[PDB]
Amino acid sequence: ANANLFVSAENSQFDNYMSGPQVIEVVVIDSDINDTDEAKGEPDVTVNGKVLRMVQAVDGNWYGYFADRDQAQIADSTATTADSGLDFGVFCASSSGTAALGFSTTETDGIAIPITIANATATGNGTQTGSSSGGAITTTCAANTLDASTANGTINVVREAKDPVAASGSVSVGQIGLKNGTANSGPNWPFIQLYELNPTGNVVVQYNKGGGVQSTTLTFDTVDQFAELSLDRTVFPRVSQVHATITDLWLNIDPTDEDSWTFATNTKNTTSSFNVDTFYQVFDENGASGGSALTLRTTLSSLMCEDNCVLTLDVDAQSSGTPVVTIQDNGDSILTQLNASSNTNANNASAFGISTETAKLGTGSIPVTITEQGPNSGVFGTYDESDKSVLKITDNAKRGTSASLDYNETPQTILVGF
Amino acid sequence: ANANLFVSAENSQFDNYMSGPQVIEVVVIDSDINDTDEAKGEPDVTVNGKVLRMVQAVDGNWYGYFADRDQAQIADSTATTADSGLDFGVFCASSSGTAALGFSTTETDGIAIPITIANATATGNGTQTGSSSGGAITTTCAANTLDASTANGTINVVREAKDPVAASGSVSVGQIGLKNGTANSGPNWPFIQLYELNPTGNVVVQYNKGGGVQSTTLTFDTVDQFAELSLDRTVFPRVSQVHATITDLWLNIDPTDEDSWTFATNTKNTTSSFNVDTFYQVFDENGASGGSALTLRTTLSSLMCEDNCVLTLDVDAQSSGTPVVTIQDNGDSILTQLNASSNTNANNASAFGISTETAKLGTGSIPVTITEQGPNSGVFGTYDESDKSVLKITDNAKRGTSASLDYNETPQTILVGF
Amino acid sequence: ANANLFVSAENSQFDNYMSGPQVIEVVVIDSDINDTDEAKGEPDVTVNGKVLRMVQAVDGNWYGYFADRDQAQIADSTATTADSGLDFGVFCASSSGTAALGFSTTETDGIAIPITIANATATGNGTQTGSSSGGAITTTCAANTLDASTANGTINVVREAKDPVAASGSVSVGQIGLKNGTANSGPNWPFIQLYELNPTGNVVVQYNKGGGVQSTTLTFDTVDQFAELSLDRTVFPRVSQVHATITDLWLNIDPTDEDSWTFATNTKNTTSSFNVDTFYQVFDENGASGGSALTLRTTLSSLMCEDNCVLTLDVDAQSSGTPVVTIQDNGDSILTQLNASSNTNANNASAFGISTETAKLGTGSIPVTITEQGPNSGVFGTYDESDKSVLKITDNAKRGTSASLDYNETPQTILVGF
Amino acid sequence: ANANLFVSAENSQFDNYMSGPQVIEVVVIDSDINDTDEAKGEPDVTVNGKVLRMVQAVDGNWYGYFADRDQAQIADSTATTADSGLDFGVFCASSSGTAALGFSTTETDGIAIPITIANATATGNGTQTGSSSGGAITTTCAANTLDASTANGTINVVREAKDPVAASGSVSVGQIGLKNGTANSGPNWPFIQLYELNPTGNVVVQYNKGGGVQSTTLTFDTVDQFAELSLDRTVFPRVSQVHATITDLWLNIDPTDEDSWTFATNTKNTTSSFNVDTFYQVFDENGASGGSALTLRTTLSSLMCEDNCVLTLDVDAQSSGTPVVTIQDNGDSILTQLNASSNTNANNASAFGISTETAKLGTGSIPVTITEQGPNSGVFGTYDESDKSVLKITDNAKRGTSASLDYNETPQTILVGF
C-alpha cells in the first residue's frame, strides 16, 4: 500500500467507493518535506491528473480538500443560511484564487472559500448559495471581497481543518501564501477545491515524489449496495435500549470530523405539511446546537442518493395502541418534552421534539439522531458514547407487538418478547 | 498500540477501567509538533466528542486533564481547607474560560482552577467548595476574580503538572494564551476540564491527526473486582516485616504523582466517636507534610466505592491477649508514638498516632499510610524504598496466633508459625 | 524506472515516441534540491548533450520545457493571432536569453518567450510569428524588447506552468534569476527552449547527478501507427449516445494541461470555399472559450501527420434523407443551434455551429470537439465528464441505415440495430 | 537493543547491576531532537516513573545524571574538602531547582549542584557536606545562594559534562533554562538528581517517545560477585612486571571520565595510628594531581561494599628480609621515593610515598594506584599506557619466595620461579 499518501476514501471495507457531495481529504506525511521552519517545496499531488494545491499545517503535513463541483453546488443550494447544513461557503472561479487565496488555482474547476458577501454584485462577487442544478462556476472574487466580509468561516462541511503554518522568516503562511491563516474561523482556511468528476468512473489520486509515483484508485458511484442497518439483538426486553448501527458512505460528508444527522422518521404523521426529511448537523458531535435545521428531502435525488439517505420509523406495526419503541435525549443531542402535560408520559414517542426547530421537528415527527463512530469510519450509531440509545423499548410493551424501523428501504422489525 | 496519544487510565492490568474522583492525564507525545519556539497550533483532542483544551509543556508534549463533573464536585465537597484532601480547587462555568484562562472552554461542563476568592459573591464567583450533591454548575468566573486572588495553587489532585511553554515573540503561554504560566503554583495551570460521564458507560478519548485517528476506550464503572491485597509470604516469623501490595485502581487519584492515603484501621476501638475512615494526602510521597487530613468515610458511598475503598485491621483474631501486628514510623510517614510511657513498649499498636491530626488520627485508630509503587501503576505498598514495612509481627507473638488484615472486604490472614 | 528524472513523452503505451509541435516537459523531483529558501544548484540535465535550463517551482520541482525548432516555428506560423492556436510566443535568438530571461541559454537552438512586439525592428526585436519553413533564428531580443511588450503572456502551447520561487534574500526569482516570475501572464515563465532533433532518430534526456546518471531516451517519429478510434458498441440503438475515444499521441500538444480540439467533420458540405480543417484550443478545457480558431489543414502535412490528424464524418452513408448521427452541446464546449426556426428540429446537424466562429464553423460544417482524458494522457474523447457525448443518434433513424466515422483514414461504421 | 536511550549501568558483563555512590548517566541520542538552534521538546525520560530533567549538549544529545540519595549523601559526607574525593557538590531541596537551576525539579528527591556556601544559614542555604546517614534533604537554595558562591564547580563525581547549548533567540542555555552555562566549572552544569532506589530491587529507566517506549531496567544490589583480580602469569621471573587487572563495577563512580584510585595496601605496617584505606581521585587520569586524598574505610561498610572495596598487599609472605614485589612510578600517577638516602635501593617499597599526601601515605603504607581502562569500562588496571605496571618484582628475589596480593578477600600468590 501507499506509505506517504493518505486519502480519506482509502477504505477496503467499502471497496474505496466515494459518492455524494462528501469532501475527500488528501494528506501527505513525508519525512522529506515536514520541516515547518524551512520553505520546502509543495508535494506534487494530482487527482485525475489535475493538480491539487496543498497547504501545510503546524504538524508539517500538507492538506488538500476536494469535492465534486456539481455535487458541492447542489449541497450548498440547500444551505439557505450561512454556516449551517451542507454549507460549502462562497464559490469563486478558478481564476480568482490568486486574488482571493494568494496563489494560483487555475487547474481546478472551482474553489469554495469560507467567507460571506456584503456587496452581492452580479460579476465581481461570487455566489453565496450556488446553483440548485449545479453547472459551471463563473463568478470571481478579489481582495475587496475578503475585506468586505462581515463573517468569516462559513464552510460547514470541513469543520476541523488543522492550523496552517504561521509566517516567520522566509516561510510564508502555509508555505504557499495564504492571506489569512486562521484555522476554521478565517476567510481562507479551510477551502475546498472543486473537481468535476466522472460518475461511475474511476477517480485516481497520484502523488509525485523521487523514487516512485503513488496512486490511489477511487470510484465515483452510488453506494446503495454498501448501506445497511443492523440491530444488536433479535428480541428486545421491556426496558432494553435500542442501539442501531448505520453504515453508509454518503453520510460521511466531513473527512475531518464526526458527521451528525437528525432525521424525521415518523411515517404516520399524516399532516399534509409534514414530510419525512433528513437534516444535516443540527447537533454537533459534542451534543450542542450545530445550527439551524434545513430541508433535504427535495434534493437527495440530485445528491446522488439512491434510496439510502432517508430513515423512517413506525413505533407500532400492529396499531395496537401501545407503541413499542420510544425516543429519549442523550449526550449527542438536545431532545426536550414539548407536551409536558401530565396526561402523557415519556412513553409517547410523538410527544418529543426539538425546541429550537419546532417548525419541522416539533411534536410528532419522531426525531432520530445518529452520530459517526469516528471522524472517517463511516459507521453511524443511535447510541451515544455512554451506551444510552436514542431509541428505547416502551416499558408497558406487549409480547408480540413489534415496531418497524426502516433504513435503505429495507425495514427491519423490532420484536418484543421475554 | 497507539503511537502518539497516551491515556493514564489505559492499562491492560486493569482493563482500561476508571472510577471515583480520578483525574485522567492525557498526553500527546507527537514528534511532529514537539518544538516550542514556533507558533504551532493546538492538536484536536476530544473525549466523547467534546473538545479537550491542550497545553504544550516545556517537554514538547501537549497536556490535558479531565475528570467527571459529579465525582469532582463530590470530592471537592470534602475539602474543608484549601490544598488538602481531594481538593479540585475552585469550579467555574464553562463560559468563564475566556475571561479567566484567556481561551474558550465552552464545550465542557465546567473547569476547576486553583484560584481563591476574596469577594465571595453569589453570582460573579465560582464555588470554593462545590455542591456535595453534584450536578451542573452555573457559577461564572471573571478577570476580577483572578486579580482578587490571595493564594494560587489550591488544586491538590494534579500536583506535578509540567511547566507551560513560556510566551515569547509569536508564541503565547502554552501556545493557547494562558494568563499566568507558573505550574503547580499558579492560577491557570494545572486546571481540570469536567465532563459528564455515565457509570457503567464507556469513555472514548480521541486524537485527530492526519493519516489516521487514534482512539482509546475507557470504562467508567466500579472496579471492586480488581481491588485485591496480597502478602509476600504465608507464614511470618516473630519480627518479619509485613508487606502489603494493594492493587487498587480507585486509589490512583493523581496521574502525574505518586498518591498517599491514610487509613484508620482499628477494628476494635469501641469508642463511639471513632469510626474506620480514609484520608488523602496526609503525607507527601517523600514522607514530608502532605497537608491536612479530611473525612471521607461518609462520602465513599457516592464515590463509586462498592466495598473497595476502605481498610480495617484486625490485630488479634483469637483475642488471646497477644497482639500480632504493630506499626512504625517510616520514610514515607510521620508516625509518632504519642503514648511514650515507659510502662508500655512498641508492641502496643494503640500507642502510635499522628501529632498534627490527633482529632481523628490520634492515639489508637492505627494510622496506616500507603504509597503508590510508581506514579501511575495503580499499585500501592506499605513498604518504602528502604524496605521498612509499616507492619511488623510482634516480637512476643505466641506461636499459632494469627492476625487478619481486611481490604475489599476480603480478609487476609497473617499466620505466625516456626 | 528513473528516480528523479520525469519526461512527458516517456509513455509505455506509445513506446516513448514523440512527434509534431509537442512541447515536452522535463521535471526534476529530487529531495536533495527540493527546498526553495536556499540557492541550491541547478540540476545539470541535458538532451542529446545540450544543456536544458530549469526553473524551480513552488512545489520544489525543477521544470523545463523544450520542443523541436522546425515544428515549433511551423506551428507558430499558423497562429496568426496572439494567445490563440498553436502560438509558441515570440522566438528569440539563443544569445538573447541573458538579456531577456536573465540567464545564459547559448547551447539552445532558440528560445520562445511569452511577449509581444510593439516596434518590429528587423534586427533588435524577435519574430512574433516565426516562419512556415523553420531554420535558424537569427533575430535577437533585449531588455527593451521585454519592456516594450504591451501584452505579456502570449504563449498558448503551455497553459499550466507553476509559480517560480519568489526572490527573497539571496534567492532569485525561481533559482536562476528570472526578471519576471508570474505563472502564465508574464513575459518570462513559461518559455520553451528550441532543439534540433533527428526524425526517426532517438532523443535522449540525460540528468547528471552525484551517484549516477539518469537517462530517458525518446523517439522523434511519426506516430500514425498509434492512432485509433474506438466505439463502445457494435450496433447503435434508437437514441443511444455515440462515444468516441481517440488515442493519438500527436494531439497531446500541451504536456501540462488538457488539450481541446474542435473539428469540421462535414465531408458532404460541397461548398467550394469550405474545406475540412482541424483547430486547436477553440474552447477552454473547462467549457469556456479558449481563444480564436485558426486554420491548420494547410499545415498538417508539414507536422508529421501521416494521415492521422483529420476527422471526417458522414452522417448518412446512403443519403436517405434521415441523418443517423446528430450533435449537441456538453460541458466541454459551447455548441449552439444557429438556426432556431421551428421548421427544423435537433436532428439537423447542419443547423449547429459556434456563434463566435461563424466564419469557418457556421451553419453546416459539423463541429466535433474532443477533450483529452487527462493532462498528459494522450487519449481524447468526445464525451464530457457528465457522459454527455457530442455525437448522438437521431431519434427518427431508419433501421439498416448507418453512419461512417473516419479517423486515421480508417472509416468505421455506426450501424443502427435493435 | 534500544534505539535512542543509553544508560551507563547497562552492561552485559555485569548483568546491568549498580551499587554504591555511582552517578548514572542517561543519554538521549535521537535524530528527531538532535538540533541545537531550535527550541525542541525536552525528551520525556523517567526512572521508576519519576521524571529526569535533561540538558542538551553541543553534541545534540540530551544529558541527565542521577544517583541514589542515601549513597550520595554518605559519599559527600567523606569529602571533607571542596572539589576533592567523592564530592557531589551542594545538596539542595527539590523545590529549589526553579530558583537555582531555572526549571522545575519537584519530582526528584533532591538535587546536588556545583556551588559553595559563604553564608551557612540553617534554612536559606543548602548543606555543603550532607550527612553520613542520609534522609530527606529539607535544606533549600535560592538565587542569592548561587550569587554568594565564591568557588563554582565543586563537583568531583562528574568531570566531563559536555557544554550546554548557548542561548540564542528562543533557545535558552541548555534548552531548558539554565542560569549559567559553563560546564565542569560553572555553578549549574553538571548536576546530579537524587533518587530513592530499592536495594535488591530493579531500577527501570523509561523513555516516553512517539511510536513506542524504550525501557532499560537495572539492578541496585551489591556487586561483590563481579569483583575479581587477574594476573598475567602463574610464575613471575626476576624483573617481571606485575600487571594487575581489577574488574569491579563499584569502583566506576564517574560514568563520563576515567576514575583513579590510590590505595594503602601495606598490611604489615603495624603502626597503631596507621590503617588500610582507599582513596578516590588522588591523581587525574592524565597523571597530574587530581585533588586531596580523603579517608573512606570508615565509610565502605555503608557503601554496599561486601568485602570488595579494599586491596591489601604483603610483599613477603615468609618475612625472609627480601621483599618480592616493589612499586614504581608511571604515567598514571606521581610516585616519589621519599627516602633518597644511598643506604637504600629501589627495592625498599616502604621508602615510596606521595609528597603532597605525606600525612596518610608517607613512608611505608605502600600506595598502589589503579586507573580505569576506559571512561565507563568498569575494569581497572595498575599499568599505564606505556605498559609500566605499578607493581614490579625486585631483582634480588629469592627462588621459592612469593608475595600475596589480596582483593575481594580472595588472596592470590605471586610465585617466583625460573
PDB file of C-alpha atoms in Angstrom, chain C residues 91-259:
ATOM      1  CA  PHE C  91      11.052  33.464 -30.857  1.00  0.00           C
ATOM      2  CA  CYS C  92      14.359  34.941 -29.703  1.00  0.00           C
ATOM      3  CA  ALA C  93      17.976  34.180 -30.503  1.00  0.00           C
ATOM      4  CA  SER C  94      19.940  31.921 -28.174  1.00  0.00           C
ATOM      5  CA  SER C  95      22.218  34.846 -27.289  1.00  0.00           C
ATOM      6  CA  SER C  96      19.228  36.914 -26.090  1.00  0.00           C
ATOM      7  CA  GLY C  97      18.421  34.774 -23.049  1.00  0.00           C
ATOM      8  CA  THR C  98      20.787  36.624 -20.727  1.00  0.00           C
ATOM      9  CA  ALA C  99      19.289  39.973 -21.756  1.00  0.00           C
ATOM     10  CA  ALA C 100      15.638  38.895 -21.659  1.00  0.00           C
ATOM     11  CA  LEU C 101      15.335  35.919 -19.306  1.00  0.00           C
ATOM     12  CA  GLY C 102      18.377  36.833 -17.210  1.00  0.00           C
ATOM     13  CA  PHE C 103      20.492  33.698 -17.668  1.00  0.00           C
ATOM     14  CA  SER C 104      22.653  32.091 -20.323  1.00  0.00           C
ATOM     15  CA  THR C 105      20.920  29.827 -22.844  1.00  0.00           C
ATOM     16  CA  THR C 106      23.554  29.700 -25.591  1.00  0.00           C
ATOM     17  CA  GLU C 107      23.604  25.912 -26.005  1.00  0.00           C
ATOM     18  CA  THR C 108      19.953  26.005 -27.095  1.00  0.00           C
ATOM     19  CA  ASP C 109      18.974  26.461 -30.737  1.00  0.00           C
ATOM     20  CA  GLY C 110      16.479  29.191 -29.812  1.00  0.00           C
ATOM     21  CA  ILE C 111      14.071  30.245 -27.076  1.00  0.00           C
ATOM     22  CA  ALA C 112      10.400  31.216 -27.319  1.00  0.00           C
ATOM     23  CA  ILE C 113       9.283  33.726 -24.689  1.00  0.00           C
ATOM     24  CA  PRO C 114       5.703  34.950 -23.974  1.00  0.00           C
ATOM     25  CA  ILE C 115       5.897  38.582 -25.083  1.00  0.00           C
ATOM     26  CA  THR C 116       4.567  40.825 -27.846  1.00  0.00           C
ATOM     27  CA  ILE C 117       6.386  43.307 -30.083  1.00  0.00           C
ATOM     28  CA  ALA C 118       5.414  46.972 -30.345  1.00  0.00           C
ATOM     29  CA  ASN C 119       8.372  48.070 -32.521  1.00  0.00           C
ATOM     30  CA  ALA C 120       9.017  45.311 -35.079  1.00  0.00           C
ATOM     31  CA  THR C 121      12.624  46.102 -35.899  1.00  0.00           C
ATOM     32  CA  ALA C 122      14.299  43.699 -38.309  1.00  0.00           C
ATOM     33  CA  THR C 123      17.324  43.259 -36.010  1.00  0.00           C
ATOM     34  CA  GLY C 124      16.740  44.329 -32.406  1.00  0.00           C
ATOM     35  CA  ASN C 125      13.403  42.540 -31.936  1.00  0.00           C
ATOM     36  CA  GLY C 126      12.496  38.894 -32.416  1.00  0.00           C
ATOM     37  CA  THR C 127       9.923  37.364 -34.732  1.00  0.00           C
ATOM     38  CA  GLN C 128       6.366  37.254 -33.400  1.00  0.00           C
ATOM     39  CA  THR C 129       5.074  34.739 -35.960  1.00  0.00           C
ATOM     40  CA  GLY C 130       8.122  32.679 -36.879  1.00  0.00           C
ATOM     41  CA  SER C 131       8.217  31.094 -40.317  1.00  0.00           C
ATOM     42  CA  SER C 132       6.362  28.299 -42.088  1.00  0.00           C
ATOM     43  CA  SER C 133       9.683  26.637 -43.010  1.00  0.00           C
ATOM     44  CA  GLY C 134      11.850  26.884 -39.892  1.00  0.00           C
ATOM     45  CA  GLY C 135      15.631  27.131 -39.900  1.00  0.00           C
ATOM     46  CA  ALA C 136      17.947  29.061 -37.632  1.00  0.00           C
ATOM     47  CA  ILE C 137      16.569  32.024 -35.693  1.00  0.00           C
ATOM     48  CA  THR C 138      18.986  34.943 -36.050  1.00  0.00           C
ATOM     49  CA  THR C 139      16.553  37.543 -34.680  1.00  0.00           C
ATOM     50  CA  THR C 140      17.688  38.728 -31.250  1.00  0.00           C
ATOM     51  CA  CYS C 141      15.933  40.242 -28.239  1.00  0.00           C
ATOM     52  CA  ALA C 142      16.909  42.608 -25.430  1.00  0.00           C
ATOM     53  CA  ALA C 143      15.590  44.102 -22.198  1.00  0.00           C
ATOM     54  CA  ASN C 144      13.928  46.947 -24.103  1.00  0.00           C
ATOM     55  CA  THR C 145      12.119  44.267 -26.110  1.00  0.00           C
ATOM     56  CA  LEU C 146      10.712  42.983 -22.815  1.00  0.00           C
ATOM     57  CA  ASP C 147       9.745  46.424 -21.521  1.00  0.00           C
ATOM     58  CA  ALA C 148       8.120  47.331 -24.866  1.00  0.00           C
ATOM     59  CA  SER C 149       5.573  44.493 -24.661  1.00  0.00           C
ATOM     60  CA  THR C 150       2.001  45.731 -24.202  1.00  0.00           C
ATOM     61  CA  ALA C 151       0.533  42.246 -23.623  1.00  0.00           C
ATOM     62  CA  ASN C 152       2.679  39.798 -21.658  1.00  0.00           C
ATOM     63  CA  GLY C 153       1.913  36.088 -21.685  1.00  0.00           C
ATOM     64  CA  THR C 154       1.030  35.292 -25.291  1.00  0.00           C
ATOM     65  CA  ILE C 155       2.094  31.632 -25.060  1.00  0.00           C
ATOM     66  CA  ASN C 156      -0.841  29.295 -25.674  1.00  0.00           C
ATOM     67  CA  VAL C 157       1.014  25.979 -26.035  1.00  0.00           C
ATOM     68  CA  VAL C 158       1.794  25.694 -22.297  1.00  0.00           C
ATOM     69  CA  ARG C 159      -1.010  26.923 -20.046  1.00  0.00           C
ATOM     70  CA  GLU C 160      -0.372  25.313 -16.635  1.00  0.00           C
ATOM     71  CA  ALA C 161       3.097  26.456 -15.642  1.00  0.00           C
ATOM     72  CA  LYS C 162       3.776  26.568 -11.917  1.00  0.00           C
ATOM     73  CA  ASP C 163       4.871  29.559  -9.851  1.00  0.00           C
ATOM     74  CA  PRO C 164       8.575  30.495  -9.980  1.00  0.00           C
ATOM     75  CA  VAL C 165      10.023  30.829  -6.496  1.00  0.00           C
ATOM     76  CA  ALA C 166       9.728  34.323  -5.046  1.00  0.00           C
ATOM     77  CA  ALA C 167      13.026  36.198  -4.770  1.00  0.00           C
ATOM     78  CA  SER C 168      13.907  36.530  -1.079  1.00  0.00           C
ATOM     79  CA  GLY C 169      17.362  37.267   0.287  1.00  0.00           C
ATOM     80  CA  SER C 170      19.986  35.521  -1.818  1.00  0.00           C
ATOM     81  CA  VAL C 171      17.266  33.530  -3.609  1.00  0.00           C
ATOM     82  CA  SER C 172      16.430  34.937  -7.036  1.00  0.00           C
ATOM     83  CA  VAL C 173      13.174  34.550  -8.958  1.00  0.00           C
ATOM     84  CA  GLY C 174      12.898  30.831  -9.417  1.00  0.00           C
ATOM     85  CA  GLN C 175      16.511  29.915  -8.763  1.00  0.00           C
ATOM     86  CA  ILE C 176      18.303  31.124 -11.916  1.00  0.00           C
ATOM     87  CA  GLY C 177      17.426  34.820 -11.940  1.00  0.00           C
ATOM     88  CA  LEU C 178      14.286  35.430 -13.960  1.00  0.00           C
ATOM     89  CA  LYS C 179      13.262  39.048 -14.461  1.00  0.00           C
ATOM     90  CA  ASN C 180       9.510  38.421 -14.106  1.00  0.00           C
ATOM     91  CA  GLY C 181       8.060  35.446 -12.285  1.00  0.00           C
ATOM     92  CA  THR C 182       4.301  35.211 -12.740  1.00  0.00           C
ATOM     93  CA  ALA C 183       2.667  31.894 -13.586  1.00  0.00           C
ATOM     94  CA  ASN C 184       1.326  32.308 -17.126  1.00  0.00           C
ATOM     95  CA  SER C 185       0.646  36.038 -17.635  1.00  0.00           C
ATOM     96  CA  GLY C 186       4.196  37.407 -17.533  1.00  0.00           C
ATOM     97  CA  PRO C 187       6.912  37.748 -20.166  1.00  0.00           C
ATOM     98  CA  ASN C 188       9.301  35.053 -18.867  1.00  0.00           C
ATOM     99  CA  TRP C 189       7.617  31.952 -17.429  1.00  0.00           C
ATOM    100  CA  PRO C 190       6.834  29.657 -19.072  1.00  0.00           C
ATOM    101  CA  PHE C 191       9.252  29.524 -22.005  1.00  0.00           C
ATOM    102  CA  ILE C 192      10.176  26.737 -24.420  1.00  0.00           C
ATOM    103  CA  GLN C 193      13.773  26.098 -25.471  1.00  0.00           C
ATOM    104  CA  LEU C 194      14.220  25.088 -29.094  1.00  0.00           C
ATOM    105  CA  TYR C 195      16.250  21.994 -30.007  1.00  0.00           C
ATOM    106  CA  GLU C 196      17.001  20.423 -33.382  1.00  0.00           C
ATOM    107  CA  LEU C 197      16.031  16.745 -33.377  1.00  0.00           C
ATOM    108  CA  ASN C 198      16.552  13.887 -35.816  1.00  0.00           C
ATOM    109  CA  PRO C 199      13.393  12.383 -37.370  1.00  0.00           C
ATOM    110  CA  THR C 200      13.352   8.592 -36.944  1.00  0.00           C
ATOM    111  CA  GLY C 201      16.245   9.160 -34.525  1.00  0.00           C
ATOM    112  CA  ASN C 202      16.319   8.819 -30.755  1.00  0.00           C
ATOM    113  CA  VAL C 203      16.071  11.801 -28.411  1.00  0.00           C
ATOM    114  CA  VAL C 204      17.981  11.181 -25.179  1.00  0.00           C
ATOM    115  CA  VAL C 205      17.404  13.139 -21.968  1.00  0.00           C
ATOM    116  CA  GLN C 206      20.358  12.938 -19.579  1.00  0.00           C
ATOM    117  CA  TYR C 207      20.451  14.009 -15.930  1.00  0.00           C
ATOM    118  CA  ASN C 208      23.947  14.273 -14.445  1.00  0.00           C
ATOM    119  CA  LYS C 209      23.681  13.890 -10.670  1.00  0.00           C
ATOM    120  CA  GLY C 210      26.011  12.652  -7.963  1.00  0.00           C
ATOM    121  CA  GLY C 211      25.980   8.862  -7.749  1.00  0.00           C
ATOM    122  CA  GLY C 212      24.934   8.075 -11.312  1.00  0.00           C
ATOM    123  CA  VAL C 213      23.295   9.372 -14.465  1.00  0.00           C
ATOM    124  CA  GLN C 214      19.576   9.007 -15.195  1.00  0.00           C
ATOM    125  CA  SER C 215      18.754   8.579 -18.882  1.00  0.00           C
ATOM    126  CA  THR C 216      15.433   8.571 -20.735  1.00  0.00           C
ATOM    127  CA  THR C 217      15.543   8.015 -24.497  1.00  0.00           C
ATOM    128  CA  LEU C 218      12.617   9.057 -26.696  1.00  0.00           C
ATOM    129  CA  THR C 219      11.864   8.707 -30.406  1.00  0.00           C
ATOM    130  CA  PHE C 220      11.074  11.590 -32.772  1.00  0.00           C
ATOM    131  CA  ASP C 221       8.977   9.845 -35.413  1.00  0.00           C
ATOM    132  CA  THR C 222       5.503   9.840 -36.927  1.00  0.00           C
ATOM    133  CA  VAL C 223       3.047   8.173 -34.557  1.00  0.00           C
ATOM    134  CA  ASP C 224       0.243   7.428 -37.036  1.00  0.00           C
ATOM    135  CA  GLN C 225       0.574   3.733 -36.159  1.00  0.00           C
ATOM    136  CA  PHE C 226      -0.565   4.555 -32.598  1.00  0.00           C
ATOM    137  CA  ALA C 227      -3.751   6.373 -33.680  1.00  0.00           C
ATOM    138  CA  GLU C 228      -7.071   4.536 -33.473  1.00  0.00           C
ATOM    139  CA  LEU C 229     -10.732   5.345 -32.845  1.00  0.00           C
ATOM    140  CA  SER C 230     -12.780   3.029 -30.624  1.00  0.00           C
ATOM    141  CA  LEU C 231     -16.560   2.749 -30.301  1.00  0.00           C
ATOM    142  CA  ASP C 232     -18.409   1.403 -27.275  1.00  0.00           C
ATOM    143  CA  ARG C 233     -20.767  -0.968 -29.124  1.00  0.00           C
ATOM    144  CA  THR C 234     -21.251  -2.771 -32.422  1.00  0.00           C
ATOM    145  CA  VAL C 235     -24.867  -1.747 -33.143  1.00  0.00           C
ATOM    146  CA  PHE C 236     -26.342   1.563 -32.002  1.00  0.00           C
ATOM    147  CA  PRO C 237     -29.952   1.675 -30.729  1.00  0.00           C
ATOM    148  CA  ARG C 238     -32.623   4.306 -31.297  1.00  0.00           C
ATOM    149  CA  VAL C 239     -31.390   7.201 -29.149  1.00  0.00           C
ATOM    150  CA  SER C 240     -28.023   5.928 -27.936  1.00  0.00           C
ATOM    151  CA  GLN C 241     -25.082   8.208 -27.283  1.00  0.00           C
ATOM    152  CA  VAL C 242     -22.123   7.881 -29.650  1.00  0.00           C
ATOM    153  CA  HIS C 243     -18.982   7.801 -27.505  1.00  0.00           C
ATOM    154  CA  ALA C 244     -15.735   8.143 -29.462  1.00  0.00           C
ATOM    155  CA  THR C 245     -12.295   7.634 -27.911  1.00  0.00           C
ATOM    156  CA  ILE C 246      -9.283   8.987 -29.812  1.00  0.00           C
ATOM    157  CA  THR C 247      -5.905   7.537 -28.805  1.00  0.00           C
ATOM    158  CA  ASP C 248      -3.487   9.915 -30.532  1.00  0.00           C
ATOM    159  CA  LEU C 249      -0.037  10.907 -29.305  1.00  0.00           C
ATOM    160  CA  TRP C 250       0.218  13.787 -31.789  1.00  0.00           C
ATOM    161  CA  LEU C 251      -2.797  15.682 -30.436  1.00  0.00           C
ATOM    162  CA  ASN C 252      -1.279  15.972 -26.927  1.00  0.00           C
ATOM    163  CA  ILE C 253       0.488  19.241 -27.663  1.00  0.00           C
ATOM    164  CA  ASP C 254       0.386  20.678 -24.134  1.00  0.00           C
ATOM    165  CA  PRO C 255       2.070  18.343 -21.612  1.00  0.00           C
ATOM    166  CA  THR C 256       0.744  20.125 -18.505  1.00  0.00           C
ATOM    167  CA  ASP C 257      -2.919  20.842 -19.310  1.00  0.00           C
ATOM    168  CA  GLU C 258      -5.769  19.128 -21.110  1.00  0.00           C
ATOM    169  CA  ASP C 259      -5.993  19.932 -24.821  1.00  0.00           C
TER     170      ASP C 259
END
